[PDB]
């Protein structure tokens, strides 16, 4: 009966399949969570090595035909797009919550009560996070940012050499500082040009105070070092004149074709002379440049760069104070050019970086830019360093946007599990088991950390639970909730002093995403797969 033309399940089989798929997805990226984890490798069919361990990239480049797997992948992608850090911890927490809710579902419990208990526990945990906040302005500031950057870059390839990369990231963030409409200061990212070039080691990658273009010079006869130049940004191709489709040329007299052919170049010559009439030295053209314009720029003694990106031109005009002019027209009917909209730079020297040259722009007079030239072995290490630098920049931006630091290492999860366990005794209904399962689901982070560190897991868990239980009672010892956990010795250290420093908005968003994923999946009890 029931002609559906496909395949279907029953009730518990689909739930078991989803739980197994979530467990497999969690175990796929369960060896690169803590700072002691190693990286993975992704090879395609043609032979392209991809060494990475951020989690989001591995989930995106996995291609799994499972609904729960695709849901987890899109959740990790949304988490990386909204924040950028903590893409695997949220997935692991969601998988643990699903595994814990499966046991309650198998115990003849309605999923609505479990969902309500999970929501109540999540709300209580969110309300409890605000109690453990530390003011960022009350500390030192620079040291706190350095510690946060070192913590964010601790699970990458530059974990050992984190004393210089963190300072470089802090300097780049302080340089790229934009002000809003006379209110709160902003910290825009994805604007610093992160170049990748093979050469020496990674310790020689200094910070370039200014901008760096990934293009070469046009003609070989142009100088490569101009002191106190004028940047002229253009948004039109420097080619010869060409009529439109609706405007044709019908030569009726032989005494006019030569004049037309001469004027076709004389117009461009006059335009070039009017452009260079203000005394410009650096001219950037996003389109094409003919040979006549190159010869004119060589004879006039000025540089010319062709095929420039739009975002790079906008950043250059914003840093130097210039204005991108798409045309030479004004408020009348004559094409002129003023000198008040010319970006003044300083030293524009072209440097060769391993068999290739690139034009660098130093600081100007309007704003301050930032450029990072990462150096490493091949392309995989350069991509890994770029990803680590982007993650560190995102973490620093999220920390500076919300002055609120929270210690890490697994103490916050244990404190939340203790608080939810102590609060579950005040309900008295069927949601107590749901709250207890929500509290026990947060203890998977210390277990995974101890597994990756190859240390005593049960002993450390018991020690953390015994140390956090004494912090709730006895108000005379309320400073025991900032002990953290160490992976190099296996004992609680200072942590909150200067070890781990992570924001709270990231953790709140990760917990909310995990709760939403556990809610949107537990409400599934039937699957209908049609045949193509």
């Amino acid at each position: 009966p029931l002609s559906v033309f496909g395949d279907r399940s029953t009730g518990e089989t689909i739930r078991s399949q989803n739980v197994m798929a979530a467990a497999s997805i969690a175990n796929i990226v369960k060896s690169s969570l803590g700072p002691v984890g190693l990286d993975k490798m992704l090879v395609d069919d043609i032979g392209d090595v991809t060494i990475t361990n951020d989690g989001a990239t591995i989930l995106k480049l996995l291609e799994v035909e499972h609904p729960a797997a695709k849901v987890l992948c899109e959740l990790a992608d949304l988490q990386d797009k909204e924040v950028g850090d903590g893409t695997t911890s949220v997935v692991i927490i969601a998988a643990e919550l699903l595994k814990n809710a499966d046991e309650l579902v198998k115990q003849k419990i309605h999923p609505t009560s479990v969902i309500s208990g999970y929501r109540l526990a999540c709300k209580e945990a969110v309300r409890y996070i605000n109690e453990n906040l530390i003011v960022n302005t009350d500390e030192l500031g620079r040291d706190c940012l350095i510690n946060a950057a070192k913590t964010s870059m601790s699970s990458k390839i530059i974990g050992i050499n984190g004393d210089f990369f963190a300072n470089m990231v802090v300097d780049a963030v302080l340089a790229i500082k934009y002000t809003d409409i006379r209110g709160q200061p902003r910290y825009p990212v994805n604007s610093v040009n992160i170049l990748k070039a093979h050469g020496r080691s990674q310790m020689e990658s200094m910070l370039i105070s200014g901008y760096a273009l990934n293009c070469v010079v046009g003609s070989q006869g142009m100088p490569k070092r101009i002191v106190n130049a004028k940047i002229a940004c253009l948004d039109f191709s420097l080619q010869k004149t060409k009529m439109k489709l609706g405007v044709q040329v019908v030569i009726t007299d032989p005494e006019k074709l030569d004049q037309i052919r001469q004027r076709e170049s004389d117009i461009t010559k006059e335009r070039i002379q009017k452009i260079l009439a203000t005394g410009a030295n650096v001219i950037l053209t996003t389109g094409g440049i003919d040979d006549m314009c190159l010869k004119y720029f060589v004879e006039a003694g000025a540089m010319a760069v062709r095929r420039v990106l739009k975002r790079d031109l906008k950043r250059i005009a914003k840093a130097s104070g210039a204005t991108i002019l798409s045309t030479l027209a004004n408020l009348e009917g004559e094409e002129t050019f003023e000198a008040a909209m010319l970006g003044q730079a300083e030293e524009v020297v072209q440097e060769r970086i391993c068999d290739d040259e690139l034009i660098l722009i130093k600081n100007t007079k309007a704003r301050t830019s930032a450029s990072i030239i990462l150096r490493g072995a091949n392309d995989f290490m350069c991509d890994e360093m770029e990803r680590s630098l982007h993650d560190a920049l995102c973490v620093v931006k999220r920390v500076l946007e919300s002055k609120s630091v929270v210690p890490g290492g697994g103490a916050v999860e244990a404190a939340l599990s203790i608080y939810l366990e102590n609060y579950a005794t005040s309900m008295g209904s069927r949601e107590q088991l749901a709250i207890a399962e929500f509290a026990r689901s947060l203890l998977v982070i210390p277990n995974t950390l101890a597994v990756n560190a190859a240390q005593d897991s049960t002993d450390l868990v018991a020690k953390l639970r015994a140390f956090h239980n004494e912090a709730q009672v006895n108000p005379e010892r309320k400073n025991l909730k900032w002990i953290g956990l160490d992976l190099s010795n296996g004992k609680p250290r200072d942590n909150k002093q200067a070890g781990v420093f992570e924001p709270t908005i990231v953790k709140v968003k990760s917990l909310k995403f995990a709760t939403e994923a556990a809610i949107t999946i537990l409400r599934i009890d039937d699957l209908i797969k049609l045949h193509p």
């Binding site: 090879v43 392209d48 390839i157 100088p223 040329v249 072995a377 091949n378």
Partner: protein, 523 residues
């Protein structure tokens, strides 16, 4: 069928690291055949159908198709090392292989890779500090020292019998390549030293011409072929009547309009020719074609024209003579006329005309002419000359010298062993392990020379224990302990530093892989 992924193979654990170490050891054992002056040459067969007979470490590795990711990473780091400094392509691979082979002893002793990477970085920092401390300066004004350095650097290739001239050739090429434009920028590009390969003749006929050598011929036999002091000019635009991209049409209704247009075309051609012959030139070099009327006008004006040239050739000609390429004939001016010539003779090298621009005032671009047997010998000579030029450029960019062979390695090993006694904890065993891993180059040199390492190794180890005994190496020709100060073997410091940095980076990158995922089809 209800599975998560399709045709996916995931492998994790110690097996991936073991396979990577085995592949690295195999690559190191394959590349170790070409090392030292007592080594032998190989022969590769490219899928195109040619013959690759050389001895460089990068030219042989680039013609080997592999499938393991470790081998691909090794090829990539070797290509980056060859493109960075130019020399030292096999030593870095051998050092990386040895460092990855000596690292498996600790991985089987339940040791975490983070401590291993920390010890590797701490050893790299100490090695860099020692290499910077044992740096010996050298003067750049002495030509004999530079010639000796070049000869000691090229004593391994097959030019060991002709380095008496190749050294001077490379020195002249380096002296002519260096050019200072505007500002305080001193660039040393290699796109202006064109190397020509002509089969035939003896190897002693090679020299350095003060100019260039274009493989072209005159357009008409009535033009001149031997000029004393000509005025070579340059062009860019074509010398013929072309159409227009503005979609133009000439609607005519009379009868003499065709004749009027045909006469106006010739009048415009004659006007352009008169605008070209304005400051009385001699040799016209254009990049496009030249019509017959312009050729006849230049013959009547006794002007030589050459068509179909390249952009790099035109740039080299402009750099050698001292002029600039002009696109419009009406804007020739006066400073754009090149008067740096002195000899323009067109000879024949095996039924083929060649243009020779010799004897210039102050040329900044030369063309090296090579005369050998077939094409493989010419390619090998060109590669050796390029390596010598790169070594000379790296020496001129950093006036630092360090004793080569095996003295610097033993000195660094002794300095690391004498400093490892103050360390404690788990960061002492890998330090002492990588401190003795630098002896893989002298051991291989001794094995390739006299194949008696069990005595020479301990003889060199017992000698470097003294105070003033840091420049004692091993002669690869005979096989005895000799001083590097009296032998004359020297090497730059930047090349060794780059080699060490690349080896350490490759070891760090390869010591952090424990998972292999293949079967996702990229997209």
């Amino acid at each position: 069928v209800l599975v998560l992924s399709q045709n996916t193979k995931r492998e994790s654990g110690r097996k991936v690291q073991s396979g990577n170490i085995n592949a690295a050891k195999t690559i190191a054992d394959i590349i170790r055949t070409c090392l030292g002056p007592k080594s032998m040459m190989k022969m590769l067969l490219d899928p195109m159908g040619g013959i690759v007979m050389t001895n460089d470490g990068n030219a042989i590795l680039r013609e080997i198709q592999v499938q393991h990711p470790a081998a691909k990473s090794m090829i990539e780091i070797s290509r980056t090392q060859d493109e960075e400094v130019g020399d030292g392509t096999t030593s870095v691979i051998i050092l990386a292989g040895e460092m990855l082979s000596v690292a498996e002893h600790f991985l089987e002793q339940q040791m975490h890779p983070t401590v291993v990477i920390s010890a590797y970085r701490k050893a790299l920092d100490d090695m860099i500090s020692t290499l910077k401390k044992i740096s010996i300066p050298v003067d750049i004004s002495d030509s004999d020292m530079m010639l000796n350095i070049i000869n000691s650097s090229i004593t391994t290739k097959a030019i060991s019998r002709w380095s008496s001239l190749a050294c001077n050739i490379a020195l002249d090429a380096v002296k002519m390549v260096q050019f200072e434009e505007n500002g305080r920028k001193e660039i040393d590009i290699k796109k202006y030293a064109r190397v020509e390969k002509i089969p035939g003749g003896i190897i002693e006929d090679s020299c350095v011409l003060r100019g260039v050598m274009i493989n072209k011929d005159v357009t008409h036999p009535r033009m001149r072929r031997y000029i004393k002091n000509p005025r070579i000019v340059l062009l860019d635009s074509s010398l013929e009547y072309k159409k227009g991209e503005s979609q133009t049409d000439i609607e005519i209704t009379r009868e003499e309009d065709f004749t009027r247009i045909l006469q106006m075309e010739e009048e415009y051609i004659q006007q352009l020719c008169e605008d070209i012959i304005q400051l009385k030139p001699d040799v016209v070099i254009t990049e496009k074609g030249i019509s017959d009327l312009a050729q006849h006008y230049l013959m009547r004006a006794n002007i030589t024209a050459i068509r179909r040239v390249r952009k790099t050739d035109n740039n080299r000609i402009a750099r050698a003579c001292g002029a600039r390429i002009v696109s419009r004939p009406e804007e020739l001016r006066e400073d754009d006329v090149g008067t740096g010539a002195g000899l323009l003779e067109i000879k024949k090298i095996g039924d083929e005309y060649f243009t020779f621009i010799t004897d210039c005032k102050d040329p900044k671009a030369c063309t090296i002419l090579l005369r050998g047997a077939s094409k493989e010998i010419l390619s090998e000579v060109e590669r050796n000359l390029q390596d010598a030029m790169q070594v000379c450029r790296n020496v001129l960019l950093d006036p630092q010298l360090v004793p080569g062979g095996g003295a610097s390695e033993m000195a660094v090993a002794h300095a690391l062993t004498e400093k490892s006694k103050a360390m404690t904890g788990v960061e002492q065993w890998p330090y002492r392990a990588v401190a003795q891993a630098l002896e893989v180059i002298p051991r291989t040199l001794i094995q390739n020379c006299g194949a008696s390492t069990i005595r020479l190794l301990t003889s060199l180890r017992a000698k470097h224990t003294q105070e003033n005994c840091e420049t004692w190496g091993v002669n690869g020709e005979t096989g005895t302990l000799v001083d590097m100060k009296e032998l004359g073997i020297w090497e730059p410091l930047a090349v060794k530093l780059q080699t060490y940095k690349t080896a350490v980076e490759t070891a760090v990158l390869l010591l952090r892989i424990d998972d292999i995922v293949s079967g996702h089809k990229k997209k």
